[PDB]
């Protein structure tokens, strides 16, 4: 019962919202895998009239690539309480966001007969802190 309910890391997305690039080189070395560009929508007065164009970049980390990154990424941030999502996700800092969820998330991510995860099976801020804290660090 406690097994199919104990959390795991869905994904860790490292991202750098610039505004115009030369930053792709560092993400590849710090994460391990390849990066991807970032575009935008709607014209902006801050010299951002070009809709579809490189502005940032991100890298979605999964499985080992995620944890091996977090081991040497969490010790660099002072995790707070408010830094947690209502869904039990936290973002700190170069931004680093960690997506947390219970063993049956595929139900909402698949194509065939997909379904949205029930609120009871949805991770909580409290249940999130607990799992994370129970792995090399402190809360609040």
């Amino acid at each position: 019962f406690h097994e199919m309910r104990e959390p795991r890391i869905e994904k860790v997305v490292v991202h750098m919202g610039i505004g115009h690039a030369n930053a792709e080189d560092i993400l590849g070395e710090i994460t391990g895998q390849m990066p991807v560009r970032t575009k935008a929508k709607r014209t902006v007065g801050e010299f951002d009239i070009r809709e579809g164009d490189p502005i940032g970049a991100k890298v979605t980390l999964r499985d080992e690539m995620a944890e091996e990154f977090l081991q040497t990424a969490l010790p660099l941030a002072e995790l707070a309480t408010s830094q947690f999502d209502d869904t039990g996700n936290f973002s700190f800092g170069l931004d680093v966001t960690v997506n947390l969820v219970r063993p049956g998330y595929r139900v909402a991510k698949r194509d065939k007969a997909s379904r949205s995860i029930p609120t009871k099976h949805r991770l909580n801020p409290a249940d999130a802190v607990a799992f994370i804290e129970s792995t090399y660090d402190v809360e609040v």
């Binding site: 194509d111 065939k112 007969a113 997909s114 379904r115």
Partner: protein
Amino acid sequence: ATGPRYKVPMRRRREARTDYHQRLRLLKSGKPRLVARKSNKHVRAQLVTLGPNGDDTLASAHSSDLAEYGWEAPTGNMPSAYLTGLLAGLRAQEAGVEEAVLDIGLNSPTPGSKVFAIQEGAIDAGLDIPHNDDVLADWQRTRGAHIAEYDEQLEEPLYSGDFDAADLPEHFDELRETLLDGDIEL
């Protein structure tokens, strides 16, 4: 849900089981649908015609009942898929069904996939279905050579319950051989 003006999707849409747009294009042919559907452990193939109160299944075949002809192997792979299609195809031929159009539901048209395998099976059973030869996997992968050579990279048996250590794509040959045979109690 919200109010009177609210629009609730069709049931089979809410459930995310039927792509109604593809459903229509499919029905336009006038021919019966060769419904190809998979599962984690199994693979099913139905021949569906259109009916007044709902669709009519004239002939079907599930990978589970594949064993009834001498299948000691798993039921969620390529050889399994092809064979299931051939069985369903043969049963269909018996019921008068002569032509059909491949319905793959929410599955993807990936080259060499199991739904195309199911398709190649039904076609081989004597059915006339609009297809594309180069989108089907090569004869050997259908046989299950990809899995036999995977087991070659042993050190640990690919199969838990003993069917065999090195696996047998030859079993596929034996089973196909059995179905194509004139006798066989369908």
